[PDB]
Design a protein around this ligand. Structure first.
Ligand code: HEM
Ligand code: HEM
Ligand code: HEM
Ligand code: HEM
Lengths: 141, 147, 141, 147
């Protein structure tokens, strides 16, 4: 469960992400594809080369969804409903992969938010991404 | 994968000799598709997978199960060289089929449940332990050429 | 989320377990210790020899908790509140280990319930154990 | 276990030359205890672990952190024989300490986070990938003698 301090941490850190959210979403995917090559099996239709516009575009979508989640932190399941439907019924990404992206998002934030990426903030962000992951995988079976 | 003691090897070979490969193959693949429905993503060309009954009775599922467990079966003769034995298959699953190796682990656990259901009390804790090592071994061998 | 059909499946299978719950809980532990030796790291204070009173007693307590959960499948969080506190604050078992015991409980049920361990029941029990695991890990952070 | 392309190797080595083991070690262990609090079960004798500030400022956490990363640094020097290198410590962690090897994986991930935090833009996607391989290697080496 996200405590009030968790919610404050998340909104503050994401606040600072601001306009770079899209750039960071792409970087996180890039990190994921290089570090955990099995994740590439879900994007056989993409050009996964460094700088790919497909990765950049997808990065923006992932980022926008996370912004939406931050904005609706008290009402995540409803806000992410269509996305939970999509992952469960069409994309069908193994639940294990969510932990890999989550880690990569964390690494990306750490690399860009020296000041804000405190141990307390790190913990809150990890809890937040696990909550998002839980919701997205909620309707798998 | 870990250490198969000649005893642990023998316990594997002995039970396997009693397996109806085609039957267990169909059952394990069908149960994978029912228990972890996301795995159905590769099989939309197999037709009707709407219910447990439809899955378990689907001839394409049964036929794919037979193919998969037949290769597994052949691997049991090469416990000493799984990586070599599964290299080309590893490559194919990565490069052409795009199958997340996590599916091999899921199948391995479903297979263990199937054997347990099939063998009852003969599937003892030590026998399970040996098969756990084999299923993890096979999964590792199939994921080895991923890049 | 457990569907109403899931709930029916679980109550049916558990009903059949009946009075053997405790012997089954012990066998599941022995299966876990043998197949996943890393789980022994949480029991250095136990005599883990086959049929030890410690394992049999522990297997009984595990089975009782499961029975409690089946009885209160609509309100698991509340029913297991005390156990979730114990696991989060005292035992502190890494969450990965819940998946290993759940797998061994599944194998145990499969080996003892030939007639009842149908694909649909298997799926329902898998989800049920995942839900129990989630509730027990709920208060970790 | 670690398969490193020459480039990934020199990448690893170059970054490690700039790490203050003392400082990064204390950071990595403290963050582990904060982010995954259940890991505190091995350090009951370390003092106050009650809040992030208590954890991060604990001298025993700082001391232990240094010890662990120093042993970790030695592995960097024997990337080709991680198992031989860590055998003794593997046994110690199993037999005397009773540490679930899953903890090695959590620490490896926290370490990556710490390096990214410390080095910023220099910790590029390819560099991270090389470190992920190393960390997995190390954790595997440490879990090797478990029984
Ligand atoms: C924080 C976790 C995640 C979030 C918020 C997220 C969000 C999204 C969004 C917003 C879309 C676009 C949907 C649309 O086109 O309307 C999408 C699609 C997709 N996602 Fe997820 N995702 C997450 C995790 C994952 C993971 C871990 C994988 C696999 C490794 C994955 C694989 C895909 C794929 C293959 C698509 C379709 C992309 C395309 O065809 O362009 N996602 N996701
Ligand atoms: C023990 C694990 C497995 C073994 C030994 C195995 C083996 C095989 C073999 C021998 C083939 C035929 C290759 C050929 O065309 O020459 C095959 C194809 C295939 N496998 Fe695997 N497999 C395993 C697990 C899986 C899993 C878990 C999935 C997905 C859930 C999967 C998905 C596929 C698919 C989609 C094909 C192509 C089928 C077709 O074109 O008709 N396999 N596999
Ligand atoms: C289905 C999941 C589980 C359930 C329902 C469960 C339930 C219980 C119960 C009822 C107790 C006894 C509480 C008491 O004495 O009042 C207990 C204790 C304990 N459990 Fe859990 N458990 C589960 C998973 C695990 C796992 C996966 C592990 C480690 C691999 C574990 C390790 C322990 C330990 C070490 C104790 C302390 C027992 C002693 O010192 O006698 N548990 N658990
Ligand atoms: C990078 C992986 C790790 C390495 C290389 C490592 C190395 C070491 C070394 C060199 C020691 C000193 C042994 C001695 O007393 O002679 C030690 C002790 C210890 N380690 Fe590990 N460690 C690692 C990860 C961990 C993790 C993740 C944990 C648990 C979270 C852990 C728990 C301990 C404990 C409890 C001790 C005993 C300290 C004491 O006596 O108070 N270690 N480790």
């Amino acid at each position: 469960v996200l405590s009030p301090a968790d919610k404050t941490n998340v909104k503050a850190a994401w606040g600072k992400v601001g306009a770079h959210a899209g750039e960071y979403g792409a970087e996180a995917l890039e990190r994921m594809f290089l570090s955990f090559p099995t994740t590439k099996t879900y994007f056989p239709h993409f050009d996964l080369s460094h700088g790919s516009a497909q990765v950049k575009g997808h990065g923006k979508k992932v980022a926008d969804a996370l912004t939406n989640a931050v904005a609706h932190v008290d009402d995540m399941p409803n806000a992410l409903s269509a996305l939970s439907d999509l992952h469960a019924h069409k994309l069908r990404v193994d639940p294990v992969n969510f932990k890999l992206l989550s880690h990569c998002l964390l690494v990306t934030l750490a690399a860009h938010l020296p000041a804000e990426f405190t141990p307390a903030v790190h913990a809150s962000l990890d809890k937040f991404l696990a909550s998002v992951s839980t919701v997205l995988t909620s309707k798998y079976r | 994968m870990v250490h198969l003691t000649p005893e642990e090897k023998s316990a594997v070979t002995a039970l396997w000799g009693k397996v109806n490969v085609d039957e267990v193959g169909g059952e394990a693949l069908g149960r994978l598709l029912v228990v972890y429905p996301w795995t159905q993503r590769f099989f939309e060309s197999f037709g009707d997978l709407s219910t447990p009954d439809a899955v378990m009775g689907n001839p394409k599922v049964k036929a794919h199960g037979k193919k998969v467990l037949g290769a597994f079966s052949d691997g049991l003769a090469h416990l000493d060289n799984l990586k070599g034995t599964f290299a080309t298959l590893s490559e194919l699953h990565c490069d052409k089929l795009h199958v997340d190796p996590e599916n091999f682990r899921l199948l391995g656990n479903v297979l263990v449940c199937v054997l347990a259901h099939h063998f009852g009390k003969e599937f003892t804790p030590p026998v399970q332990a040996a098969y756990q090592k084999v299923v993890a071994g096979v999964a590792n061998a199939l994921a080895h050429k991923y890049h």
